[PDB]
Structure formats: C-alpha cells, structure tokens
Design an enzyme around this catalytic site. Structure first.
Site, PDB file in Angstrom:
ATOM      1  N   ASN B 366      36.317  52.358  42.861  1.00  0.00           N
ATOM      2  CA  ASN B 366      35.739  51.899  43.714  1.00  0.00           C
ATOM      3  C   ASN B 366      36.247  51.942  44.658  1.00  0.00           C
ATOM      4  OD1 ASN B 366      38.499  51.163  42.528  1.00  0.00           O
ATOM      5  ND2 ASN B 366      37.859  49.276  43.253  1.00  0.00           N
ATOM      6  N   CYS B 368      38.443  50.618  46.382  1.00  0.00           N
ATOM      7  CA  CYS B 368      40.360  50.896  46.131  1.00  0.00           C
ATOM      8  C   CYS B 368      40.956  51.847  45.661  1.00  0.00           C
ATOM      9  CB  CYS B 368      40.570  49.584  46.258  1.00  0.00           C
ATOM     10  SG  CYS B 368      40.330  48.216  47.678  1.00  0.00           S
ATOM     11  N   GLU B 370      41.836  53.292  42.284  1.00  0.00           N
ATOM     12  CA  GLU B 370      42.057  52.495  41.383  1.00  0.00           C
ATOM     13  C   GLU B 370      41.416  52.822  40.242  1.00  0.00           C
ATOM     14  OE1 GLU B 370      40.960  48.163  42.375  1.00  0.00           O
ATOM     15  OE2 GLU B 370      41.508  49.316  41.023  1.00  0.00           O
TER      16      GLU B 370
END
Ligand SMILES: Cc1cn([C@H]2C[C@H](O)[C@@H](COP(=O)(O)OP(=O)(O)OP(=O)(O)O)O2)c(=O)[nH]c1=O
Ligand SMILES: Cc1cn([C@H]2C[C@H](O)[C@@H](COP(=O)(O)OP(=O)(O)OP(=O)(O)O)O2)c(=O)[nH]c1=O
Ligand SMILES: [Mg+2]
Ligand SMILES: [Mg+2]
Lengths: 679, 679
Positions: B366, B368, B370
C-alpha cells in the site's frame, strides 16, 4: 502494349503540378500514372485464383473473409454478383483514388505483401454485408457503388465482410451527468471507443462549475477542465481515436474552457443560443448560470432547459447564481482562438431546436459538427452498473455523389438504396462497451445520408459556385433528395411494422413537418436549373406527392428518427472522385503529403483546361457564397452540415465574426472550423 | 484561579523551543499551554447541555449524531457510558494533542463556531459504534481508548457515530489485469475511492510492456506510463486522495517507470525478488520478461507467477521475450531517485511470500508499505459489469500504545478488545463503489493491529533504542501480542461459526504456522527484559499455550485472515501521546507547521531534563539499529511494517544501498521511504 517505357507513376502524377507558358496543365499525365500504377504495382502484387469459388474458399479458410456473411446467400448468387461486379466496367479516374484504395482500403495478405481485393471485390463484400441476404438489395447496392452514386462511410466500406473486422460505425456523441458515476463512465467510454478508432464527442454543459458546492459544503467543485484533462489522456492512450467536448456559451466555465486552447489534443465546440447574439449587439453583459442551481430549482440539467426562453426568468430567480462576462468580448475570444486553432466549433442551439422535428432538445454535436440529434441521461448504481440506460448517439453515415445522381433517371431508387444501406449499418450495430450508445441506436435507427461533389457537378454543367443558378439547384436538389428519403423511411416502417421510438411525439406524427413543403417556392427560380432536372428525367416533387407522403407518414410512420447529415468527405472523396463537401474545392490540384515521394496530387473532377475558370477555389469564392449554398441545403437536411470557412491570412477576428454573424442570421445550424490559408 | 495572567497558549508552547545555558527545556510551559488553551478557547466555545439525555436528543435532531447507532442500546446504558467516560479522569498530555483533537477531530456545529464533543464524547461514540449493541464490549472499548491503550485509525476515530460520516476505512490495494476493461475500472475506482479520501495503491506488474502486441499486430502497446498518467489525473481531480503504483523489478518497463520520477504526484513502489540481489552481487545482468508472453505460455499473469523460482526456466523458454539491464545499475537508479524523492518503496517479494501463511502470493502493497495480503483477479463484461468479482484489499487499522499496554496486567483483554474493534470495522464495511474491495473484505475479515510508542516506552524504562535490551523486548513483546491476537481470532471464529475464506489452505489449518513458536528462543535474553514483564504481571506465552492454541486453531480456525500490521502513526500520535512508530523519534521537540503562529511544538512522551540522553533521535541512532528493531518485530507480524531510514544529508547512494542490503539480509519485509535530514 508490347515493350513500353516510362513507368514511374509518381513522376507522372507530379506532372499535374506543372503549368505551361499558357497556364495549362497536362491532365493526361495522371491517367498515364494510373496505367503505370496498375502495370508496375497493382497487377504484379495481386493474387489471382483459378475461380471465384476457390477464392472464397481460400479467403474464408485462411481467415480473411467472414463465412457468416457469405452464408446468408446461395453460393451461386454469390458467384454471380462478383461476376456482375467485375463486368461493370469500373475504372479509377485518378492516380490518387487508385493509390488511396490500394494502400489503405483493400484487403492484403496478413504479411502485407499482396492484395487480395480489387475495387469490385470490396464493393461486392459491402453489398453482401449490408444486404443481409436480400439478393435484390445486394445487387442494387453493388450497382449504386460501382456507378459512383453511393459511397458508404470509410469505416463501413473498409470492414464489411472481413473476418478480422473493425466497427462499421466510427463517430459517437455521449452526454455526461453531474455526478461522479457519470464521469467515470465517460472516461471509460472514451477508452473503449477510442481503442476501436471511434471519434467521440462529450457534452460538458451539465457539469457543475468550478467553485460549486458538493454535499452542501461551499467552494468545492473543480469544473470541466479537470474532466477534459482526463478525457484528453484517455484519447492519447487508446491509439485514430480523436475527441471533442461541447460547452454551452452561458456556462460559468465558458472562459476557462476557451482558455485551454490559448489541454492540447481535444477539440472544443461551443453551443450558442440567440440571446448571446442579441447581447453582443447591444454591447451588454452575458449572464452565466450555475448548473448546480438550475438542477435544484428546475429539476433538469443545464443542458436540458432552454436558456434563451428562460434567460430573464433565470436572471430573476435569486436561487440561481449568476456570473457575468462581456458578450462582445466572448465572440472576440472565440474568433481569436479560432484564428489560431480552427475551432471551437459552433452549434446554434436555437436554430437547431427550432428546426428539430424530434421531441426533445439538441444540446451537442460531433467531432465534425454535422450530427444533431436528441439524447437522454443514464443513471448509475454505485458499482457503475447502469440502473437506467439512457440514449446516446452513434452515427451511421454515407454519401451520394450529386453529379452521378443527376446522371441517373431513377433517382428514387438511388436514394432508397442508400437509405436501406445506412439503415442496415444501424440494424447491425450493437456497441457493447457503452449501453447508452446501443440503446440509442436501437431506439432511433438514426442514419445520416450526405452529399458530395456539388462543386464538381456545378462546374461540369457550367454553373459558378455561389451563383443564383447554383443556389437554385442546391435548394431543389436537396428538396428532392429529402422527398425520396422520407418516403423510403416510411416504406421501411411499413414493411417492418415499427417506427422510431417516440415517433408519436414528432412533427412527423402531427404533420407539422410538411407544412414547409405544402406552401410554394419549389418552382425553379432559374431556367437552367429547370433544364437540368428535365434533361435528367428527374421529377421535382409536386404538392400532391408531398400531400400524399404526409398521409402515409402520419399513418404508417417512418423507421429512422433522422435521415440526412452532410459531413466533410475525407479520403473517400479521392476514391469516389468527388469534390469534398458541398463546399468549393480547396484547390485545383489538391496536394497531399503522402507516399514515398512526399506528395500526391489530385485534379478536380470534370476539370480541364477549357473549364478552369469554373474551378475557383474556396478562398477565392469566399465565405458568403459558401454560407449561402449551405443555407439552401440547411432548410431540408434534418440534422446538420460541416461548414468550414476559408480565409486569406490577412483576415481579422472581426472578419471571422462578421461571417459567423451572417451564418447565424442566414439559418446555418452549425459551423465547423475556420481555416486560414497556410501551406 | 481567580484573576490570573499569561493566557497565550501558543507562546507557551513555543517555550518548548528554548534551551537554557545548561541545555535544558522548560517542559512545564507546555502544560501551562494546555491549561490556557482550555480556559481561553475550549471551554468558552464548547456547548454544554442541561443533561446527556437532552444532548443526544438535540444532536440527533439537528443532524449531527446518527440515531441508528444509539438505537442499538437501551438509552440508559447509553447515558451511563457517557458518564463513565467523563469520570475516567482523562487529560491531554500535550498542547499539540489537545489542539490537534479540537481543530481536526472533534465534532463542531455546522457553522464551525462551537464544539459539540470532547475527547470522551468521541471515544464514547466510537465505542458504541464498534460495539454494535454489545454493552460489555462497548465499555471495554471505552476503557481501552481512555486509558491510552488502544487508538483506532484516524478515519474510524473521526467518523464513528456521526450522521454526516466519512468512511471508516481509508486505504486500499487494487490489482489491474492486462485488458482494457480492467484498466477502465481502475481509473474508475481511483475516482470513487479518492473522492472518499482513500489512499489507493495499484498493481501494474500484469500490464503488458511498451511494444508488446495487441490483437497479434506487433509493436502496439504503450506500457504502464500512460496508465500511470490516467491514475495520476484521477487522483488530482478527486479532492486527501493519494496514489501509489507498484511494479515488479523484472518487468520490462522497470526503467521507464523509475524514470518518471527523475508524473508528479503518484508514489512509486518496486517489488524486488531475491534473484535481483544475487545478480547485482555478481555484477550480472537482469532479465526482464514480458507479461504478454508469460500469460500465453504459463496461463497466469506476470504478477501471479514466481519469478525467482522460475527465473532460469523463463530465461530458457524461447517463447518468452527477454530484455536486459544492469542489476547493479538498477539499484543505483533506485537509490538516486530515493535520495531525491523518498520513494520508491520496496517490497521484498520473496521474503514476504516465504513468511506468508496464506495460500497465494503477495504481489503488491500500500501507500505506506505495511500492508501485505493476497488478492485475485476480477473479470469483466464489455459493458464493464463484473462477470467474476475477485478479491482486492481494503485495510482496517488500529494501534496499541506499548507503554500503556505494559502498564496493564490484563494484556489479554487489551489485545482481544482491539481485535474485536478492528474486526467490527471490517464487519461494518461495504465499499459499494468497488465490488472487489467489498468481496475481499467480506471473505477475509482481514485486519491490521499495530503498535506505537516503543521508543517512548524503552526510554521511560531507561533502555536505549537499538540496544540488546531493546531488541530483546521488542521480540518478546511482539511475541506475546501475537499469541493473544491469534487466540482472539480463534475465539471469534468459534463464537461465530465461520472462518476466513480459504482457511483450510492456510498454514493455520495445517499447523505449520506454529512450528516457529514450538522451538525455543522465547526466553528473555536480557535480565531487564525478564524484569519488565514480571513487574507488569504479563506472562510470556509458554510452549504449552502455543501447543494448546495450535489445537484450537486447527480445530476451530480463526476469523481474520491477517491480524497485525504496523503503519506509521500520523497525527493520531500526538493525540495518543506516543512516539510514532516503533522507530525512534524524529526529534526531541518535534516541530510542526500548523496553526496561526506557523508552528506547534511537541515534546516526546516521558521525556524530561533528567532523561534526555535516552532520546537520541532517528538520525543519531541510524539505520542499523532501526532495521534491527524492525527485524525482531517482523518475525511475528503476519503482514508488514512501514520502515523509514533517516540519513544525514551527506549520505551517498552506496550508503542507502548498503542499508537496503542489510534490511534485506535481515528479514525485513518492506521499506517505506528513505528520508534525508532537511528542515
Ligand atoms: C468529488 C468531487 C466531485 N466533483 C464534482 C464532479 C461532479 O460534477 C459533481 C457531482 O459529484 P457527485 O458525486 O454527484 O456529488 P455528490 O452526490 O457526492 O454531492 P452532491 O450530493 O452535492 O451532488 O461534483 C469534483 O469536482 N471534485 C470532487 O472531488
Ligand atoms: C487498445 C490498446 C490496448 N493497450 C494495452 C492495454 C492492455 O494492457 C493491453 C490489453 O488490451 P486488451 O483490450 O486486452 O487487448 P485485446 O484483448 O483487444 O487484444 P489481445 O486480444 O491482444 O489481448 O493492451 C494499449 O496499450 N493501447 C491501446 O490502444
Ligand atoms: Mg450528487
Ligand atoms: Mg485482451
């Protein structure tokens, strides 16, 4: 004959670009170009079979011809038609037509090394395709095409009958509603249409302006530009895939819109109602209304109400936010952008609707400004599924070559065939990627029969473009074509037991459509024009005929919601050998930047050294004469006509504007691009 | 008290940015900032009602609170919970947390002039929303939130209970298939998700490369860039709406892709398998394979086969077109782009799949880096309708504050509540605009429980970030959290009679997931770490417990397909008062450019002048220590952890690369952005 020299066809073509000390051209050289082309190129790379029968066999076997098309006929009828075709005596009239047909239209082996079709093979396949098993109709189509009287749109002419086949229709008009689903769909449609080579135009007038609310919070919307940005990118990706957007002149983003072209590949088009002209006249201000408020208060979208008729009402409603710009400055910006880019196109909303015999309003047009039909919104589910499939517009085209039409007495058969052919293009269409296009075409059966070679004809007959004779002819010629097309459509509805959706609300139903034709002025104003129809055996429809057709239409209805539409003829012109529109020739020897030499030259039809004076080019004739000609045709063509004005490079925006004012006052439904001499 | 001066909260906050001749800070001033904020601002503009009862009444009546949420409980329980809430003793620990909550998170009257909620009101509404009528669960959520132990993701914390409410989930991962329908959908999804504030990442690895065929004709495709161009424009329009794209390192457009950032707002992410590292080591070449051929020959898309495991096979198959670049130069370009822009993110495909207990491969992540879960293709009809709804990934998050967790003996209840809370976020989601997201969330019940304030804790307890003590703690702390989360998920499946789709094929089903925990090294390596757990009353799961859970999991299954995921904590950090990740503090007094003064300063939790030496910032600690810490956690977190490396502005691409090499060798599943000191 036995051992002959000079076989460089391009060099021969190029002789057309030479003038002798008396300013004459050797037109014969082109013909020698043709002959050399056939001898050195066409014949040597064409595939000949032992018989027609073995050819179809092979062509279907190796995946070139679609056996489904052939299967709708007794193979024997099939062999007979190809034979009738090649017996017709067909000849290309120009080196460009021939080369154009062999390099871009005819079927080649998949490796590209050999031709598998000649003109009559392509025509034959088209006739079989459109005729759909109707033998008598397939023969006629064949005849109409070979004689030069009819020429289907490029996309049909090229794909019919092929196994690996494109779409038969390539021009679409979609509307966009003021919500994210409708926007996402539009970008999707652009994508699925563009990949298939379609020309797509989008309506933006319903979108809420930059600064309008969203979910009640103020100053939030981004307006049209960012949506234009998306449609622009979709058209670049899917590639041959061109786009247009139309915006109402009284929409709040009108100047931001125009300012994009001061977005690089999208064409712009503006809808201008009559009020706008009144305002500029009195140097007044233009009120721009917000589509967001108009929806809330009137319950229909910007692009669905009538601005002119509600102008004052809207200015008075304090629940409708108004914005203001200078009308005269608007036209000024318009002319300046047109001066540089050719567009925006212009669609005269009030003129259009006033002439529209179909229930509903016309709020947009196409990439060539000739299509004018009604449309309706589609609604969506959040997953993008359609919950209500509205009606958008696909556009099925073809054109008759005026000279050849006049050269055949049975003008009623000529038109009826064409209508039956276009109707087939409509009947066989099922654009799956965009349900609103499929629904619409299925509900309206709308087609667009057009004309070409008007200038070619008037010249041949010794009449000067724009002249009182010419205007007389183009009025009565479109008068008669209209009579036979409406008749054909009525016959179709009768022999098929159905009419276009919403016929009952049309002016065809009530009878008001004919009033025009029931009054007089269908008497040839000119004596030559009376002579031309008579010498051809064509009978100008008489009041009795109209009166009779009125009863038939009112009783049986017509199949097609729209019948005529006159686009510019692209390269099919060179094939059919016609002068492009109904507009004057852009040149005596049109020069094209094509091929291994860089250019190919094309002489106008029927032109010789003894009649050059009849071929004054579009620049020399000028806008008035052109506008005037189009005006006569616009009185009959139920849709529209792509109208381009050609100007000297010293023309001014005031000149442009004055032309547009004249077009407007004269009845013109729309204007295509303004072009300035530059080569 | 009665008549007091100095009430400028910003000035007081600003005192945190002052050092005295001994290099000390007046931390007290912040507290005085809080007090002055409450007195001059919060209290004066907050709305007080005669009772809770009349407040709910009003709040529902004027369209602020959603009566549907309240309706799932006896009104009395409702009044009692708000009372228990305001009785808890809750206090903001910092001037920024308070201001951050009042200026961006709490409910205000529609005109924006007054507050209608305080921290406990928002927590209460969240607890009622998630608890869904379960009174005992609503009280716990309330308690967990007020004590600081749990902090739901911003999008949930902000919208729960509101009438005019956003989505509770804001982060999505969609895959794109190699066909125009799937592309059109992707642009549509971007649009419908972005407007709703979602972060959307797109997989590009299945798209056929620039130059690949289309309908058999050679050199025709445009590759990913033009699709990136479309997704980029959609994200700009719909606005807060951010995008990412992931591309496999061995995809033919890899360098063109990277070259876009040498496209302005999209984030890039690269998937790198182990082979790529081997190649660069031996200064070899990288083979790039064509997704077009891979599909034809292997029957699955590029992003669905295993490159490392089939590297040689692919190079040998002459039916798979190969392209070549310099591996070492690839990493070089990567580091150089990262040096300037922070990304591309990096996802270690082989590391990820090897650790993945779920049947299937993980081909993307994604915005970010994670989130790491499986996905599956959707197929479409030409009208864009889904004919097969595949599974994409939405991502439901929340995080525990390590210090407060350790400060409560019943760590099993702390975790179970959080899991029950996130699970609810999943259970209440139905993203209608994109069926693959709705199907996926419904099939997997995937959630992402995370951690924060690790540094805050280690400092408080006198342990230095990165140290052997620290590594010991973060390994055993994640060890125990994992035990209780899997237990909770098992209980859910049991009390609900259903498991995640495809449980049977998981490593949970066979039992292989536990092997790890059945061997030793769960004995505290450090003596302090043993002391911390003991002084807190937390029992480190023993082999018996694991062995018992193994049987329970194998027999009853678990409800959620994925349980942990450690993102960076944005501004919720300031509210919960935690040090952002599990990574060191970016500063002692973090400075933020917010508010009417331009900046607001935030002191780290538990930091005082007598323990500054325990707050070495992320730069000072450096990459190794950070990577090491993340490594310990990565052994347990079934998804991923956003890992950022902070470098001095004199670091070199070789430095960056060496870090990434170390991360890779160390087990790290993914790397977020590389950041260089610049303020
Ligand atoms: C979301 C969003 C919408 N728009 C524009 C696009 C459409 O022309 C218009 C309508 O979007 P819609 O999705 O209809 O708006 P809505 O129904 O959420 O809000 P409302 O109820 O106010 O209609 O909003 C933007 O310009 N930017 C955006 O971010
Ligand atoms: C049409 C078209 C497709 N593409 C790319 C986008 C997709 O990644 C890929 C597949 O498009 P598709 O629509 O699957 O292609 P197709 O099914 O018509 O052709 P084929 O049968 O060869 O698959 O083609 C372009 O890059 N430009 C284009 O103009
Ligand atoms: Mg709306
Ligand atoms: Mg395909």
């Amino acid at each position: 004959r036995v051992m002959q020299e000079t076989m460089d066809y391009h060099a021969l073509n190029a002789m057309l670009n030479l003038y002798d000390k008396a300013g004459h051209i050797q037109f014969d050289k082109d013909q020698q170009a043709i002959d050399a082309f056939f001898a050195t190129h066409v014949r040597p790379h064409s595939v000949t079979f032992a018989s027609q029968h073995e050819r179809l066999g092979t062509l279907v076997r190796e995946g070139y011809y679609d056996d489904a098309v052939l299967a709708r006929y007794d193979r024997a009828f099939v062999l007979r038609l190809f034979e009738h075709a090649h017996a017709s005596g067909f000849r290309f009239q120009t080196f460009l037509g021939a080369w154009k047909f062999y390099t871009s239209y005819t079927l080649k082996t998949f490796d590209g090394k050999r031709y598998l079709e000649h003109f009559e093979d392509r025509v034959t396949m088209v006739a079989l395709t459109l005729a759909q098993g109707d033998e008598t109709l397939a023969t006629q189509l064949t005849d109409e095409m070979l004689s030069g009287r009819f020429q289907p749109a490029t996309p049909t002419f090229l794909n019919c009958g092929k196994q690996q086949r494109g779409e038969l229709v390539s021009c679409f008009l979609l509307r966009i509603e003021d919500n994210m689903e409708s926007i996402g769909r539009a970008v999707n449609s652009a994508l699925q249409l563009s990949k298939r080579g379609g020309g797509v135009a989008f309506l933006l007038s319903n979108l809420r302006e930059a600064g309008a609310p969203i979910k009640r919070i103020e100053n939030q919307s981004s307006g049209v530009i960012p949506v234009m940005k998306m449609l622009e990118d979709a058209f670049s990706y899917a590639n041959q895939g061109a786009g247009a957007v139309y915006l109402h002149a009284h929409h709040p983003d009108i100047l931001r819109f125009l300012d994009t072209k001061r977005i690089k590949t999208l064409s712009l088009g503006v809808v201008i109602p009559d009020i706008t002209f009144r305002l500029a006249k009195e140097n007044a201000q233009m009120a721009l209304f917000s589509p967001y408020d108009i929806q809330r208060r009137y319950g229909k979208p910007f692009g669905d109400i009538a601005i002119s008729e509600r102008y004052d009402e809207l200015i008075a409603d304090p629940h409708v936010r108004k914005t203001y710009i200078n009308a005269r400055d608007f036209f000024q910006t318009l002319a300046e952008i047109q001066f540089e880019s050719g567009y925006p196109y212009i669609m005269f909303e009030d003129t259009v609707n006033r002439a529209n015999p179909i229930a509903g309003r016309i709020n947009m047009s196409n990439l060539c400004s000739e299509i004018l039909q009604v449309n309706s919104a589609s609604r969506y589910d959040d997953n993008l599924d359609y919950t209500h499939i509205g009606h958008d517009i696909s556009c099925n085209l073809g054109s008759l070559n005026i000279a050849h039409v006049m050269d055949s007495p049975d003008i009623g058969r000529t038109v009826e065939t064409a209508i039956r052919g276009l109707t087939a293009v409509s009947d066989m269409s099922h654009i799956r990627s965009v349900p609103s296009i499929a629904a619409g075409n299925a509900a309206s059966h709308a087609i667009g029969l057009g004309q070409m070679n008007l200038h070619g004809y008037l010249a041949r007959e010794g009449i000067a473009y724009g002249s009182p004779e010419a205007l007389d002819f183009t009025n009565l010629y479109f008068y008669t074509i209209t009579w036979h097309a409406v008749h054909t459509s009525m016959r179709l509805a009768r022999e098929r037991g159905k009419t276009f959706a919403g016929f009952a609300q049309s002016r065809y139903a009530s009878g008001d459509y004919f009033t025009q034709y029931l009054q007089d002025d269908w008497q040839p104003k000119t004596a030559k024009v009376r002579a031309l129809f008579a010498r051809s055996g064509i009978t100008l429809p008489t009041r009795e005929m109209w009166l009779k057709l009125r009863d038939d239409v009112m009783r049986y209805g017509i199949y097609n919601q729209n019948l005529q539409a006159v686009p510019p003829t692209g390269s099919i012109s060179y094939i059919n050998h016609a002068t492009s529109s109904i507009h004057p020739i852009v040149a005596k020897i049109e020069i094209r930047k094509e091929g291994k030499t860089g250019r190919v030259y094309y002489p106008a039809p029927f032109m010789t050294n003894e009649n050059l004076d009849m071929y004054q080019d579009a620049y020399d004739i000028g806008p008035e004469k052109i506008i005037d000609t189009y005006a006569e045709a616009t009185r009959h063509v139920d849709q529209g006509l792509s109208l381009t004005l050609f100007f000297p490079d010293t023309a001014t925006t005031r000149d442009i504007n004055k032309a547009q004012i004249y077009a407007w006052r004269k009845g013109i439904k729309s204007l295509y691009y303004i072009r300035l001499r530059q080569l």
